[PDB]
Design a protein around this nucleic acid. Sequence first.
RNA 1: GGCGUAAAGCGCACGCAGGCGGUUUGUUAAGUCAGAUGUGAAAUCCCCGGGCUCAACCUGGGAACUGCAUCUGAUACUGGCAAGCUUGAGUCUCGUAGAGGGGGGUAGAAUUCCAGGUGUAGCGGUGAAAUGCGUAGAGAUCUGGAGGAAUACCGGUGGCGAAGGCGGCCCCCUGGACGAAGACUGACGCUCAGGUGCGAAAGCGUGGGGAGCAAACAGGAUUAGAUACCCUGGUAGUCCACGCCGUAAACGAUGUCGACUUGGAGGUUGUGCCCUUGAGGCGUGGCUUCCGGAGCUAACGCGUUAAGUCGACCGCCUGGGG
RNA 2: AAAGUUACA
Lengths: 88, 218, 129
Amino acid sequence: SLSTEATAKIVSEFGRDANDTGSTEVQVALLTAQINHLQGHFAEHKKDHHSRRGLLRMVSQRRKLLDYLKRKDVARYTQLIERLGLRR
Amino acid sequence: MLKAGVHFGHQTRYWNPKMKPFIFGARNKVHIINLEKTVPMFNEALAELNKIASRKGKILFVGTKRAASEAVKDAALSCDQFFVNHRWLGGMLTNWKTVRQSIKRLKDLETQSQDGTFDKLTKKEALMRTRELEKLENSLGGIKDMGGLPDALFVIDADHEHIAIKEANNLGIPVFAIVDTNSDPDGVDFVIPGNDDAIRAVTLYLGAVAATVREGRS
Amino acid sequence: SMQDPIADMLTRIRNGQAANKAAVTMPSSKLKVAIANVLKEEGFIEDFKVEGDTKPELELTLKYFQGKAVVESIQRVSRPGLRIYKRKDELPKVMAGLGIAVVSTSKGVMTDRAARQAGLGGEIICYVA
RNA sequence: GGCGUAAAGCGCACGCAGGCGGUUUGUUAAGUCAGAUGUGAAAUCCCCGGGCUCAACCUGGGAACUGCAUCUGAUACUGGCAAGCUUGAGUCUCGUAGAGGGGGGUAGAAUUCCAGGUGUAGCGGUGAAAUGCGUAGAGAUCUGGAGGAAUACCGGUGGCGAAGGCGGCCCCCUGGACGAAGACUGACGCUCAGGUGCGAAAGCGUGGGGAGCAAACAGGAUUAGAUACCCUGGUAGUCCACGCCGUAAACGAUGUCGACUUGGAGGUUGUGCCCUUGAGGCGUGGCUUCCGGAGCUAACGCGUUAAGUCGACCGCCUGGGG
RNA sequence: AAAGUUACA
Ligand SMILES: [Mg+2]
Ligand SMILES: [Mg+2]
Ligand SMILES: [Mg+2]
Ligand SMILES: [Mg+2]
Ligand SMILES: [Mg+2]
Ligand SMILES: [Mg+2]
Ligand SMILES: [Mg+2]
Ligand SMILES: [Mg+2]
Ligand SMILES: [Mg+2]
Ligand SMILES: [Mg+2]
Ligand SMILES: [Mg+2]
Ligand SMILES: [Mg+2]
């Protein structure tokens, strides 16, 4: 579930400060890390419908943050989706 | 002015939330009645009681719980007034056009105890008539001398004497009731927040009230 | 979520009068202060206060002429789901003029009688009868 | 105007279009508002008059024509734009309780079957009986073994899950709630037609598996009849893998999301403080059960988890039958 | 254990 060491790495990378956890870059990147990580889990457990519901909450709530960040400043959104790798 | 300090009460751990302004909690799961907000309204009730006693309004005292069962007799029959010490008959005020008949029978039986039903008839009938007379007397007691409806009602428990309060509200009779923390202010016209299930307290209430009435007779 | 803070304001007043509270309190706002100003000068509610630095908090002292509550009926008219704008011709009268209607004109928030004298119209915020 | 029970809340959720949207400042004037102009045919309608002796009818002026367009200005509200602010929403740190889910193992009890050893004449069943099983030796009892399915006690208006639903123990994958104190983002929000997903049992398809139960079916009774209830059996099914179906009295017959409005008694699960003293006490949070106040209402009843007072969206109803 | 039915003003 995105172990504490893994989260610190992403927070420090996309965060504009060492303890900046909450900026939409970090939030989206944290969601992307877990969505990609959970992808392997569901290639084995197809009928884990309850865990997939939690995954869909992350998929949708990332789109809400991505759609939000583009509205505020389309430039910072473009460097995000390119560096993370998504939006296709 | 917070003299006796024997009227803090609380009746229980719980309460009736309408009693909120007059109480604070205590360590024993107990609701201390604010006497500082009891003495001002108590004088107000005494002030109006003095006013109606000047108009000769036939003040009625109501107490049925064993604490006030005998004390109400002591205060009402003390000066000039009436009382109900036993069970309050449902409707002895609103249905007074019928209860007045029972008083008339009680007087007739009271007369019969002096000229009629004592030896002019069998013991099998004299006993039952006498048994009925004391049954009628204990229930229709102090109100036997009341000429009709009263003008002010004094109550010891709002919750216990709820029927009498509702009857007085149905009529046009002000209700001077003392209320615990478990009672209901909704219905009485002069709240007197304090203990009511204790001899030390009800005697203080009755003694103060009766003294006010005796002044009012002047 | 909360989408009509003013309708929230009227509900606190309505429930506070129904609960016989000595004062109701809600998060403050420019519009709430403007309306509460109308209600205070009109007699329906007593003095009001705004406290706070970064979270303003508006308190209204509810008024009771007798055992009853002064504010008998207070109703929201122009809600976010339906905006009601009135010309100067058709400004509503509440309880045959005994009550008031709080209306937002281009010259501030006033009553129906005040806006009528000013010869303006605007949004019908609420009826206060 | 309604939707707990009268007709009416989709089974549940995610979610695009749409609808709505916290607070402060500025700015623009789009909605909105105040005038003005152009126009809104005449006649009809209305109001004040006039003429047929009155009336109908005819007719002079108005007022209307609730509209639209343009010009000027007002900025309180809504909208656009800019800059913010944290209350909503979310991210992180630490911990907590869980039948939440998927996968893989395994433990014991019991039923059945098979093979054996004692051993006898009944067993089984019913309201009574009978079919059935049993001297080819049953039932009973002990030993060994095989198989499948379900997890006694704990166990609880206990818990978890959006709903359906989830109950031995152990592992490895995973989801979601909650709390304390801290930072962080800064309206990122609510609802949701169409769409998408999940969705008891039964059922269907293809492979397995099959102890026990058991539709169908058979026999025995019961009955006037008995295609039933009862008895003895017994196949699909119930179990697994993977697809399909997509319905339930899928129900607290109560859509979701916020706010506000007396109380009492409990359960469950976090926590921060004193006298850590020792059982304890005072508070603060989240879910949950019962009773009840006002209020509500046709009444039953609901009642801080509203069916109270309100807002934002959505769904649905319009007499009974057909 | 068995126990079905019985047109309205
Ligand atoms: Mg209707
Ligand atoms: Mg029905
Ligand atoms: Mg439902
Ligand atoms: Mg949408
Ligand atoms: Mg739950
Ligand atoms: Mg099935
Ligand atoms: Mg099958
Ligand atoms: Mg059978
Ligand atoms: Mg259905
Ligand atoms: Mg169910
Ligand atoms: Mg339904
Ligand atoms: Mg209803």
